[PDB]
Amino acid sequence: NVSGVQGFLFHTDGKESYGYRAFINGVEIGIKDIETVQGFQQIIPSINISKSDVEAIRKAMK
Amino acid sequence: VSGVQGFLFHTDGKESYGYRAFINGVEIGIKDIETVQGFQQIIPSINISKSDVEAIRKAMK
Amino acid sequence: NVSGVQGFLFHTDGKESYGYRAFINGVEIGIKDIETVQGFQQIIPSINISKSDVEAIRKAMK
Amino acid sequence: NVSGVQGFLFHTDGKESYGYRAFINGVEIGIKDIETVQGFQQIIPSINISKSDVEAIRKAMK
Amino acid sequence: NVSGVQGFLFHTDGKESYGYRAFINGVEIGIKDIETVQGFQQIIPSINISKSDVEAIRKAMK
Amino acid sequence: VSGVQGFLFHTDGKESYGYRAFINGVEIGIKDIETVQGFQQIIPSINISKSDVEAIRKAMK
Amino acid sequence: NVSGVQGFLFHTDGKESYGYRAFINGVEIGIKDIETVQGFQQIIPSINISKSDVEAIRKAMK
Amino acid sequence: NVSGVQGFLFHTDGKESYGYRAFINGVEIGIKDIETVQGFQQIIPSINISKSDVEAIRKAMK
């Protein structure tokens, strides 16, 4: 509530990384730096999503 | 705070359909176990028999 | 409201069973298998409704 | 509250009983069986209302 | 939330009683019997309001 | 669950205005201490100087 | 949200005071007396804002 | 949450600082004084965002 942010960070630990990304207030973005990942980890969850499942999650988050 | 409402579902019965999910009212198939474990951090994961998926789809519409 | 499901399972322990049914997001459905009943029991309540009272509950849930 | 039900059961312990009744999502119903009363007691409150006060409560619940 | 009732019971312990009354979902009603007062005391607050202050509370509850 | 949002207010300063309240955005005077004690069961009771009531009225509008 | 008030008190402890002010339900007001500051401190937060930052906070609170 | 403020403070601990900034009710502002940072830290989260990631966060906070 208080942060004005709803969403989550996502990444894969699989063979081909896509780095960290996030859905923030329904907007998908890439995150370039680990400082930002740790900053957002204080206010939103951070989960794992395989590279092959990102397309379907995108569709559901639309 | 996740901006996600829904659940993962699978059956432990004879004819598995793997893992699927309802995410914000959209049904999807899940290809990898990593994704199942990731979403298990933020949404419930329940069992649904293959025979009951059609009725749950109607209710989730 | 993390599950995206509001409702309840219902059944009777009376002489003439109607099996398990549910109201899920205002939609009434039949449940065929016990696995599904136990799955939904993790996220929604499960109560008893006599066969003779189902008609009135349907009217109120409309 | 995940049941999708708002309301209460009501009855009187006074001289002229009207059995159990309920308001469920703003709809008043009669309850025919004690099994149903016990089922709804798992998800909604159960209170006492004198027969003389039911008319005024109906006006307020409209 | 669960009861589908928002409001309060009110009465005075002053010299001229007006009995018990209630605001239920923005509707003011009189309560005739103590059974009903005790029933609603399970789900809504019960406060004291002097007879001379009822008019102003009515205006604010409109 | 009371269906009431607001607060009682009074001053302990030199020029008392007795007790007043904002109830659901309506300002009222309270005539009897019984009513003050009744509403103290369901809403906060705070102090407001007589000089500040005009600005609080503007904000509560 | 029992008090019907959303907002905060603000002041600076810097060299040039602007006294205490508040945002109450999106309306900015000045507070003249400490009694009122202590009264509102029972229901809303009270924070520090430098005189030079008030203009930007006003813009964000608009 | 009674402050009427949703958002967060952000800064970087990386090589090129941009000082402290904030999103307050969907409005981005610069913060000039540390007193204001400490004041808002009483009511909103304070996280780290790399300078390289600010552009994407602005897009998501729009």
d(CA C35, CA B52): 9
d(CA B23, CA F10): 51
Nearest Cα to Cα of residue H29 among H2, H5, H1: H5
Q: Alpha helix (H) ranges present in F1-61? A: 33-39, 53-60
A40's CB contacts (< 8 A; 6+ apart) are: A5, A9, A22, A24, A31, A46, H47
Q: Are D57 and C36 in contact (CB under 8 A)?
A: no
d(CA B6, CA A56): 14
d(CA A12, CA F29): 63
Q: Are H61 and H28 in contact (CB under 8 A)?
A: yes
Residue contact A35–H56, C-beta within 8 A = no
What own/partner pairs with CB < 8 Å and gap ≥ 24 does G10-14 have? G10/G46, G10/G47, G10/G48, G10/G49, G10/G54, G10/G57, G10/H39, G11/G46, G11/G48, G11/G49, G12/G48, G12/G49, G12/G50, G12/G51, G12/H35, G13/G48, G13/H35, G14/G50, G14/G51, G14/H33, G14/H35
| Residue bearing tokens 């549910």 | C22
End-to-end CA distance of chain D: 22
DSSP state of G26: T
DSSP state of E44: S
Residue contact D60–E25, C-beta within 8 A = yes
d(CA F59, CA C2): 36
Burial of H36 (C-beta count, 10 Å sphere; 0-12/13-18/19+): buried
d(CA B53, CA C43): 16
Q: How far is CA E61 from CA A55, E10, E17, F25, in A?
A: 52, 13, 21, 10
Residue contact A30–H56, C-beta within 8 A = yes
Looking only at the bridges linking them, the beta strands covering C46-48 and C7-11 are parallel
Q: Are H12 and H49 in contact (CB under 8 A)?
A: yes
d(CA E39, CA E33): 10
Report the number of secondary-structure helices (H) and strands (E) in chain E.
2, 4
Interface residue D24 vs chain C (CB under 8 A):
yes
Q: Are D51 and D16 in contact (CB under 8 A)?
A: yes
Nearest Cα to Cα of residue B12 among C37, C35, C33, C40: C35
CB nearest to D3's CB, from C7, C56, C60: C7
Q: Are B48 and B6 in contact (CB under 8 A)?
A: no
* Cβ atoms < 10 Å from Cβ of C13: 9
A62, B4, B6, B8 alpha-carbon torsion, rounded to 10°: 90
Q: What are phi and psi of G59, to 5 degrees?
A: -60, -45
Q: Class of the B1-61 domain?
A: alpha beta
- Give me G28's structure tokens: 């900015």
- Give me D62's structure tokens: 């409209």
* Cβ atoms < 10 Å from Cβ of G19: 12
- CATH code of G1-62, in short, is 3.30.720.190
d(CA C37, CA C21): 9
- Give me B8's structure tokens: 């993962």
Method: X-ray
d(CA E21, CA F36): 18
Q: Nearest CA to CA, how far is B20 from chain C (Å)?
A: 14
C vs D, Cβ pairs < 8 A, gives 69
Interface test with A, best of B19, B28, B35 (most A CBs within 10 A): B35
d(CA E34, CA E19): 10
d(CA H51, CA G59): 23
B23's CB contacts (< 8 A; 6+ apart) are: A57, A60, A61, B4, B5, B6, B39, B43
Nearest Cα to Cα of residue G46 among A19, H43, C46: H43
